[PDB]
Amino acid sequence: APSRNGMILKPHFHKDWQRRVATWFNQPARKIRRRKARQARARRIAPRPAAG
Amino acid sequence: TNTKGKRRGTRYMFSRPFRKHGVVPLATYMRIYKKGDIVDIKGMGTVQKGMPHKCYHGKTGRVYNVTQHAVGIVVNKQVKGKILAKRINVRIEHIKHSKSRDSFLKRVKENDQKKKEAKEKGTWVQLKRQPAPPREAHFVRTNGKEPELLEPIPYEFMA
Amino acid sequence: GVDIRHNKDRKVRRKEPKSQDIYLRLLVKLYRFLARRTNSTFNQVVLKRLFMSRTNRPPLSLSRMIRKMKLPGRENKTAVVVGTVTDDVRVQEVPKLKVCALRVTSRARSRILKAGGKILTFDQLALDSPKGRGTVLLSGPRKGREVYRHFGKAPGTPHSHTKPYVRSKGRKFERARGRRASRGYKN
Amino acid sequence: VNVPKTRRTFCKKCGKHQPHKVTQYKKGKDSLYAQGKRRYDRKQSGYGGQTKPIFRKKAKTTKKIVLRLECVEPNCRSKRMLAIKRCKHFELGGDKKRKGQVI
RNA sequence: GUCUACGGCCAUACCACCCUGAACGCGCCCGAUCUCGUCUGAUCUCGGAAGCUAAGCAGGGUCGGGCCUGGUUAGUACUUGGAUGGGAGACCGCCUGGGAAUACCGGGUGCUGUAGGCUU
RNA sequence: GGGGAGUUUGACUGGGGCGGUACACCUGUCAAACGGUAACGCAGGUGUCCUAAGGCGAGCUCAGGGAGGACAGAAACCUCCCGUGGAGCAGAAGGGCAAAAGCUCGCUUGAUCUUGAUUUUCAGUACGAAUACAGACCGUGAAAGCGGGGCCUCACGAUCCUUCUGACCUUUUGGGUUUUAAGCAGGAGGUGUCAGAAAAGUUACCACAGGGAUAACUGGCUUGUGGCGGCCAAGCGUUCAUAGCGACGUCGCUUUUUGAUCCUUCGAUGUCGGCUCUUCCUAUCAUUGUGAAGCAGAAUUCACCAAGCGUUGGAUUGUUC
RNA sequence: AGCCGGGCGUGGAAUGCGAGUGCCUAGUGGGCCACUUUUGGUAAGCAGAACUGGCGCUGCGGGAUGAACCGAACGCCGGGU
RNA sequence: UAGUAGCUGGUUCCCUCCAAAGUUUCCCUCAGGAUAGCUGGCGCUCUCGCCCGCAGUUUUAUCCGGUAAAGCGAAU
RNA sequence: CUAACACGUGCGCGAGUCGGGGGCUCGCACGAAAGCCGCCGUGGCGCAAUGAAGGUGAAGGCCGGCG
């Protein structure tokens, strides 16, 4: 029920949103893995540009 | 519950006085209202145009706008726990100059005049209206006639 | 039994800053002493404004300060503001001013120093003028915050130019029923 | 009520009082391709039955009838809608009545 | 003393009957070509000046009606606030303040503004 | 197309239901001399009507009564006099109105286009209604003026959708033309449960969450109704108001009748009778002791102290009766 | 009518008292009783209103007892009344 | 599926200060909500140690009313 | 507890502000932390509103030159 004064809100939480939740606790590990793969490819292509 | 009609319960308030029906005297039409006069409201049922609502009957307001036939006036109305100064338009028949202000104006002129006077004389004069003071001592002279006795009268039935 | 009411018995004004930093509290000590051992009320006003909160100490712009100090009579006096002096970019000519404030924007300080004025802090102000003679006490626009556009007489009510709370501005957001004579009513 | 077939009244296009021929406005035929109608059949098509409400609790026995006015000036011939209060029986310019005759 | 034109307050000015009106005025009054309108020049409109205060109108009168203003009714009726007052109740008394209205008995019977006359 | 599916089956409310609408409005009263103020309080009205019954101007005065005039009369038409409204103004009521707001004529369409402000219910929001203006086009009158509906107080309707009207109007998405469609502004078509859902029943086969906010027992307050008892004394009693009664009145008592209410109890106080058994009341049927009779005796009445002791056996009916 | 400029302070009744203003906001939206006024009802510890004060939210002295009556409202103690 | 419940029941330490409402309007609204009202908290702008204002009060002026009473030799 | 919003408070910077995503730092006890990027500010919020839309889009006041 509306209080005295405020904004009308439409939260989009009428589905089973708690089953589909993407936590980001693997973000630093993902960054580390991407780095390691990047340096591995850079070593693999010996004199070639690393960027491509 | 009651009815919300605009003229409910006004059969005596908006009626005309006894032996005073008929043509409105023209002096009411021939008065001048300027901006800022204190004025009284008294609904007259003879004319129905521009009749004020019954809740302003007997109220005193201040003129803020003058128009061909009517006058706009600011008047206070007590609504529940608050008072609103609201402005209404009333035709000139239902209106009348308030004499509560002219007394104060005349008093202002008169005490200003007596303040201007005696300023050179240096004497003291009272201007503030003091309340009715207690009666001072005096003598009551009997003229040789003694006051007469007063006694209650005996009970005796009339009806 | 005494026929009294205790509703408004306790006054709500601030006795001390709600902040916890130490520099402001040292300033408060100094100006407390100055206010209670000096008859000048400038110290009292400054101490009271030191007590106040952030939203009650709005920033003062360079344009405002120069505008209020260019008025006749107040030449070569020190402009005192208890807030923050922020730079105004839509002003080219800046005179030399003697400013005192708790904190000054870097660009504003550069502008004043280049123009030739000097920046003072409330400490050195105490040393220069304990009772504060030759001071022009200014303040930023307190009603400048946008929250004040939502306050007052409610919208959707005649003769009320109050901003509503809308999540997005557009033609589909609070424009149809109470805002048009064509659809229902117009307030 | 009785209303004459001619009325000298204001004309928006002419910007002056002009004679007007008046008739009774009747509702036009509902186009099949209005946006509301198209949305209505799009929603009704398929399964689920009736979707929008059907009003049934009629209560009023009359309706405000509207006069269609037309400026008689051939160059202008602009038209305007004018409506007056409700009436059970209504006629246009019939048997202009007269007073003090035999009942 | 007073009238006419326009009024203000709208009976202290109205209503009924009776008496008196110098001068001006207001009227009644005499006619229907024109203006105008009617069944009818009765009304209205128009053109006049033989006669008259008869009427209107003005002033005055009535142990007049009414109206206006006082006394009486009356500190009665009613009523603000108070009591661990009375009474089975209905109601009543007191304290603190305010305070009416008929019947009945007196007095009065238009004031006045602007402009213009008459009383040479 | 109830074979089957989903769903609904208003509210108010001296329990609910039936009844009614007090559910949207208006008049008088209640209402306690500003305003506001309740009940299924009282008396009533509304969902319309009007090309004039709107707007001006002019001229007349109404209801009723008295006195007269061929048919003519109680009432047909004409004349005079009186006539403060006792008539009329569409409707309920109230207010208002006399060279008018009434009656009769003349001319008209201010019942038209448009932006704002204000009042009424009010939250001081809408709708509805209304009030002063202002800007154009007009009507009427010689004119001053008056008029943007009805003398005032009531006669009415959001969003979404549809329909009509308006502009050398905007968009119709890569550009251009034309149909079409969508916009902008103003009306209409509703929601009367009238601030506006699209809606039939039954359940004793029933279920759940609750409710003593609410019914069906008792108990409380009340006592109209029931029952019982007084005072007055018209009359009855052959004569005689009061041996015994007692009209027309009027004052009470009781809670063994019924009502009225809804205070307790709905996480339950086992809801008719009969059988059995005890105790209590007296408003006494009998017995003990008395007083009065229209008490000769017998029998029988009325009254007093008085509840100690008794107040049965059966047919019919579930019965209380 | 609005503008400017100028002159007037005995601050023009009594009494009392600091005042104005802005945000955010919980609970509540079953009430009951009493003097007086008052509607329905035969009446009711009934039903319905107006004003004020109470109870609810509140203990204390008194009315033997008691939500509302009379007195009086409250920090822990001594004395007095 | 820990389905929904405007409906019952429960809802855990101390002291200090302030302190209510059962009323208005709308709602298929009447055991519930929204909105005013009543509350608290946070402040802020000034003030006195000549003067400003305000008031559940009085006084002096001035208007407003149709109840109590009274009247029917005044209207209905 | 998460998300959104409103308001009040504390801190930094301030017409700007914010690396949250990514990358560079010999990856790695703590460290999945911390530091840095600035030609990684893309971007968000703010700095301009109004209109349905086509669109438009935020002062002026005095003297000399033909009251």
Ligand SMILES: [Mg+2]
């Ligand atoms: Mg809440």
Ligand SMILES: [Mg+2]
């Ligand atoms: Mg104390």
Ligand SMILES: [Mg+2]
């Ligand atoms: Mg407080």
Ligand SMILES: [Mg+2]
């Ligand atoms: Mg199909």
Ligand SMILES: [Mg+2]
């Ligand atoms: Mg003649």
Ligand SMILES: [Mg+2]
């Ligand atoms: Mg004469």
Ligand SMILES: [Mg+2]
């Ligand atoms: Mg004569």
Ligand SMILES: [Mg+2]
């Ligand atoms: Mg007389």
Ligand SMILES: [Mg+2]
């Ligand atoms: Mg004269």
Ligand SMILES: [Mg+2]
């Ligand atoms: Mg002579």
Ligand SMILES: [Mg+2]
């Ligand atoms: Mg079925």
Ligand SMILES: [Mg+2]
């Ligand atoms: Mg009153």
Ligand SMILES: [Mg+2]
């Ligand atoms: Mg006339």
Ligand SMILES: [Mg+2]
């Ligand atoms: Mg006009």
Ligand SMILES: [Mg+2]
């Ligand atoms: Mg009429």
Ligand SMILES: [Mg+2]
């Ligand atoms: Mg069966």
